[PDB]
Structures are given as C-alpha cells and as structure tokens.
Amino acid sequence: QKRAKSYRKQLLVYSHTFKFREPYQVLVDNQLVLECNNSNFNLPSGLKRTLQADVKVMITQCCIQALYETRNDGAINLAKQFERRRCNHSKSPAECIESVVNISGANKHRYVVASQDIDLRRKLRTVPGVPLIHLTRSVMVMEPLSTASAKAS
Amino acid sequence: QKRAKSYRKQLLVYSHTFKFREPYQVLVDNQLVLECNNSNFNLPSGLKRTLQADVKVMITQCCIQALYETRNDGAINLAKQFERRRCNHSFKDPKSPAECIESVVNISGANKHRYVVASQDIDLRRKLRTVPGVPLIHLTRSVMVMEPLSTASAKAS
Ligand SMILES: [Zn+2]
Ligand SMILES: [Zn+2]
C-alpha cells in the first residue's frame, strides 16, 4: 500500500520522461525464476502488483536455457508460461539481458528488468530509464526486548 | 550481523536476569511451520542462528493437530521431525494453538519453563509480551521490490 504510493510516483517518470506505456515489458532472469519457484512466490501477480498495470512477462532464450541446465524441473515449467524473447545468441544470462536492454546506453525497447543478480542491476542503473525489480528474501527476526522483560532488569 | 550484534545484547538479559541457557527451548507454532514449508525456509537452522546457540525445537500436540487438519503433507512432515511437547489438552480441555502455547508459556504470570516462542501469530505474540522473559521470534514475508529511481533516470527527467 505504502510502497504502491512511492512506486506510483516513480512509474510516472518512466511514462513521462521515457515514453513507457502499458503493458510493461519485463525481462525476468533465471535466478529470479528459481527463487520464486522454490519459495512459492507468484512472479506474474507480483509484477502486476508492483507495476500496477498490465505486464507482459518474458524471458530471454539464454536465461531459460541456463534454467534448462539446472534441470530444476519446477523452475523450467514456470519460465515456459512466460513469453520468450528471441535473442539472437549463439551467453551468460547476465550478458544476455544487458545486451538486449542496453543499446548504446539507451533502453531503446523500454524493458523493465527483474533480476536477483545485484551485479547485473548495478550495471543496468547506468542506463537511463530502466526500472529494476527484485525479491527481498525472507528473514528470521527476534522482537526487541519487551518492556516487561525490561522491568525485571 | 547488524542483528547478531543486537541479538547478542538481548540474549544477555535473558541469560542474566532470566537464566535462559543453551540449549534454548523453542516452541514453534503451526503457522510458522506452515510458512517455513511453503517458503522453503530452514526453520531449525534459522532458530539456531538467531539465538546464537543450539536449540531444542518443539511443537505442542495442539499445534501439530491443527497442522493435521490443513492436510498439507509437507508442513505436517516438517513438524513431525520436531520434538513433541505433550500438553494435557483434550476433547475434555480443548484448546486452539494460540491458547495452547499461552497456557504452557504463561504460568501464573511467569515463563516458568523458559520457553522462547517462534510464531507468526501477532495476537499470540502481543499477549505474550505481557509475560516477563519470553523471547519472541517470527518470519518476515519475502517481498517484491522496485529499486528507487536511478540517478541516470533522474538526470534525464
Ligand atoms: Zn541471449
Ligand atoms: Zn495443547
């Protein structure tokens, strides 16, 4: 809800200064796919939620090939529901996405990229107008000390 | 470690004033188990890490019976690997998981058995902070996020 607010403001600039229009085109990388699979995160609905608009969710042939090699039969089937972006390659998932998104330092095709590869994200921020999405992992927390615990000192 | 550091200082009072000792006696409720199965989060490893010591992971019979009813075989089997905490709760004295844990942790106003409670039930958590000296643990939901606008984006505005 609260984030939907901050995001609403961010999307605006992609639409105005960058000419982005529904449905957003989102390249999903292999790591994100694995991740969402073995933690049961609905990747499709997750993107429509955060982008707050129709999204076309896609995966490059290099990313899905890499998935193929994991023989992680569960990730694979998921990737397949997505629309394939036919890259003209032969590379690593990372470089694939980079060369597809980064055309002469411009996001010519107005992709958004959802990746768990913080290395790929860093080098995409360089390119102006590239929305970046990722999944924050689950963590185990201990509540701060209660006041009743406090008063026993 | 930002946490490991913080948690270290918190455990100090539980051991100092409340006499908590490795291995920690942790009650794990049915919601937490369920969500750790669906997230593939290693519950026993998580607890061992956050408490910074070996732990005996237990679940009351009331909590596991609730799991049985969900007919979620993965969570059920996860629970089955835990030490069972026998309560004397029945068709005679029936209790929900929350009421079960509370009756077993809150003894005349004191955590007599020095349980730590790991639970996704905020209401149970709130009722337990009442009792002095009960460590509380829970899982955050993994969330999808969009990075904040990049400088390269802002500059071109
Ligand atoms: Zn490619
Ligand atoms: Zn019980």
The CATH number for A143's domain is 3.40.50.1010
Distance to chain A for B91, nearest Cα, Å:
34
Q: Which helix (H) or strand (E) holds A85?
A: strand A83-85
Do residues A67 and A33 make contact, with C-beta atoms less than 8 angstroms apart?
yes
| CA-based nearest distance A31→chain B, Å | 14
Helix (H, G, I), strand (E, B) or coil at B55: strand
Taking the C-alpha atoms of residue B11 and residue B30, their distance in angstroms, rounded to an integer, is: 25
Q: Which ligand is nearest to the CA of B101?
A: 2
Residues of chain A positioned with their CB less than 8 A from the CB of B129:
143, 146-148
CA dist., res. B120 & res. B29, Å (int): 8
Which of B17, B50, B144 faces A50 most closely, judged by CB atoms?
B144
The alpha carbon of A97 and the centre of ligand 1 are apart by a number of angstroms equal to: 7
The Cα of B92 is separated from the nearest Cα of chain A by a number of Å equal to 33
Q: Distance from the CA of B100 to the center of ligand 2, in angstroms?
A: 4
Structure tokens at B21: 């000792």
Q: What is the DSSP track for B78-128? A: HHTTSEEE-----SSS---HHHHHHHHH-BTTB-TT-EEEE-S-HHHHHHH
Report helix, strand or coil for B75.
helix
Angle between helices A118-125 and A93-101 (to 10 degrees): 20
Q: Which ligand is nearest to the CA of A29?
A: 1
Spacing, Cα A87 to ligand 1 middle (Å) = 5
Percentages helix, strand, coil for chain A (3-state, rounded to 5) are: 45, 20, 35
Q: Does A151 touch chain B (CB under 8 A)?
A: yes
Give the distance (Å) from ligand 2 centre to CA of residue B80: 16
A47: which DSSP letter?
H
Q: Is A106 on the interface with B (CB under 8 A)?
A: no
Q: Resolution of the deposited coordinates, in angstroms?
A: 2.5
| Contact between A28 and A112 (Cβ < 8 Å) | no
Give the structural domain span for B46: 1-157
Query: What sign does the CA torsion over A88, A93, A98, A100 have?
Result: positive
The number of folded domains in chain B is 1
At A63 the three-state DSSP class reads helix
